[PDB]
Design a protein around this nucleic acid. Structure first.
Ligand SMILES: Cc1cc2c(cc1C)N(C[C@H](O)[C@H](O)[C@H](O)COP(=O)(O)OP(=O)(O)OC[C@H]1O[C@@H](n3cnc4c(N)ncnc43)[C@H](O)[C@@H]1O)c1[nH]c(=O)[nH]c(=O)c1N2
Length: 453
DNA sequence: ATCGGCTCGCGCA
DNA sequence: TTGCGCGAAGCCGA
């Protein structure tokens, strides 16, 4: 294992108990550098490895759709793990308090957690270090090239990060070894409890039917692989040419699995690389899962204010500021945006895709966000509303790719200046008529019309 | 240091 | 649609 994937959080003396993988971002049994390191650390000490996961109360901020998708994954994973003789524990509370307690409770030898740039995981980690005395390690098991290794600074753009990343790919793109089973030796209640709490909040139809259609993405490590497999057989070949067409199902559809770590993106890269197809599609796809996925982790990790105005570049701050007092053609409230009551039937269509499938087509995510800027009273409100809806209804929400993506659309982060406009200033414009030239807009609106109810 | 090159709309064929 | 050349625009890093 490449030791540059390991960061030492808290130095100390190796206790003589088990090795504890605090699993958080990467909820998979396979292709998991964090669980592989733990087992290594375990194996030399002749102790077992165990996995702990903390079900916090953040689930009350989203909906049944994300929380059933996550728990059904953890149920499968639990089985996966016990078959490898690795027990799994599940705590319910504040990771700062519960993990600390647990580590003392079970006399853990060493502590290990996977990596995530989001503000709140570092808060927990800090709290955790004050509460323990054993060594504490962190492993990047989400990125092909560990976030802190790929760059030491905020990258202004893909085209600056891209040479830095591909120089290190030969070293970090590699196969995964086997999760060796242990040698030395309730989730269902939680899920029924959580839904009963979230139920008053369900996104319902007029006839009391749920909006959300749970059949588009089956959750779990197994299903995730079958999705990847299926993208490579049918859709990879056409990806470069039809990726940007909302009327063709030609995306990988991996982002819900990746978000929850139910499959490794290092694995996808390994499998796409070895696939023969259209070079242009492979190149198109690899740029998305390598450059754009991981510069997003770079963004949050070096900009703690990643979900606010002040993280924008100077030029875009200037510009939006200078157009704060422009007359907006339209001003909608969150509640109107939420229910698709704008004047723009293409915009409403894509919000109905969001509402019922929990995954809005990549290209329409750009449109969607910019019309929120154009049709709200201020850039901050735009940011607020676009974050709110993104995180509440996307299956892949509350994710670095989220904040980095919204910042692109509303703030030109990782983007450049365009012709000055009213209201949106120099931020990249997108039009209805421009979509008309690019895809059969009417089909798209047609598909999601019968939903206004 | 000096300037080439970065993930839209639109005219047009 | 489909692709090209052009525009408008701020800045990093050879
Ligand atoms: C307004 C808005 C909001 C969001 C986002 C963009 C925009 C404009 N993104 C990014 C992007 O829209 C999203 O990752 C894709 O829809 C994922 O779907 P597929 O895997 O089918 O993409 P596709 O199959 O084409 O790409 C495969 C993978 O490449 C990566 N990728 C693709 N587009 C990317 C992008 N624009 N930025 C970064 N990585 C990208 C992702 O890992 C994705 O799973 C995001 N992503 C996310 O998963 N959750 C979110 O909540 C958001 N938030």
């Amino acid at each position: 294992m490449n030791p540059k994937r390991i960061r030492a959080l808290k130095s100390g003396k190796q206790g003589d108990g088990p090795v504890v993988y605090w699993m958080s971002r990467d909820q998979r049994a396979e292709d998991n550098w964090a669980l592989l390191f733990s087992r290594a650390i375990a194996k030399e000490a002749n102790v077992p490895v165990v996995v702990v996961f903390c079900l916090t109360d953040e689930f009350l901020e989203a909906g049944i759709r994300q929380y059933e998708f996550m728990l059904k994954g953890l149920q499968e994973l639990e089985v996966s793990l016990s078959r490898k003789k690795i027990p799994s524990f599940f705590l319910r509370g504040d990771p700062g308090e519960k993990i600390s307690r647990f580590v003392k409770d079970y006399n853990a030898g060493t502590l290990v957690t996977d990596f995530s740039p989001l503000r709140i995981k570092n808060q927990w980690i800090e709290k955790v270090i004050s509460g323990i005395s054993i060594p504490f390690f962190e492993v990047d098991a989400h990125n092909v090239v560990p976030c802190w290794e790929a760059s030491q600074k905020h990258e202004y753009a893909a085209h600056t990060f891209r040479p830095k990343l591909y120089a290190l790919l030969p070293e970090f793109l590699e196969e995964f070894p086997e999760l060796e089973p242990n040698s030395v030796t309730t989730l269902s209640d939680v899920l029924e409890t959580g839904v009963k709490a979230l139920l008053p909040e369900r996104a319902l139809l007029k006839n009391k039917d749920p909006l959300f259609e749970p059949w588009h993405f089956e959750p779990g490590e197994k299903a995730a692989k079958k999705v990847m497999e299926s993208f490579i057989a049918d859709r990879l070949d056409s990806y470069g040419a039809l990726r940007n067409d909302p009327t063709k199902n030609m995306l990988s559809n991996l982002s819900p699995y990746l978000h929850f770590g139910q499959i490794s993106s290092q694995r996808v890269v390994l499998e796409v690389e070895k696939a023969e197809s259209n070079p242009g599609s492979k190149k198109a796809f690899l740029d998305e899962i390598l450059i754009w996925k991981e510069i997003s982790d770079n963004f949050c990790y070096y900009n703690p204010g990643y979900d606010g105005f002040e993280s924008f570049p100077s030029w875009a701050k200037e510009s939006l500021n200078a157009h704060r007092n422009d007359v907006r053609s339209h001003i909608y409230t969150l509640e109107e945006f939420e229910a698709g009551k704008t004047h723009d039937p293409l915009w409403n269509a894509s919000q109905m895709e969001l509402l019922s499938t929990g995954k809005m087509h990549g290209y329409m995510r750009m449109y969607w966000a910019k019309k929120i800027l154009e049709w709200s009273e201020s850039p901050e409100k735009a940011l607020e509303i676009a974050i709110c809806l993104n995180d509440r209804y996307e299956l892949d929400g509350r994710d670095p790719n989220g904040y980095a993506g919204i910042a692109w659309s509303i703030g030109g982060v990782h983007d450049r200046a365009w012709g000055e406009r009213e209201v949106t200033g120099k931020i990249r414009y997108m039009s209805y008529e421009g979509c008309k030239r690019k895809f059969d807009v009417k089909l798209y609106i047609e598909k999601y019309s019968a939903l206004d109810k």
